């Protein structure tokens, strides 16, 4: 599908509310495998299971290993911009 830009708002006491799988060491994108109900990704409305996360706040995630992506994603705070695509 089309590449989308998606805004997510979170406070510092919560996580993003997603589960991710994949990573460059496995030859697969960073993929959203779960959206936790009621948490910030669910509330933002624009992120879905099956989406690949291509970038976050201008940081490219297309070539990142799994744990690299965890560190990058968990560092982001407040108003967070995602670049995502559903295949």
């Amino acid at each position: 599908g089309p590449i989308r830009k998606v805004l997510l708002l979170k406070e510092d006491h919560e996580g993003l509310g997603i589960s991710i799988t994949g990573g460059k060491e496995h030859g697969v994108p960073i993929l959203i495998s779960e959206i936790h109900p009621g948490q910030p990704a669910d509330r933002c409305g624009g992120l879905h299971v099956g989406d690949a996360i291509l970038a976050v706040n201008g940081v490219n995630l297309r070539d990142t290993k799994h744990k690299e992506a965890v560190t990058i994603l968990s560092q982001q705070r407040g108003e967070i911009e995602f670049e995502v695509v559903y295949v």
Binding site: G15, I18, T21, G23, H36, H66
Partner: peptide, 7 residues
Amino acid sequence: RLPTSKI
């Protein structure tokens, strides 16, 4: 086998 992380 792929890893999964809750974040």
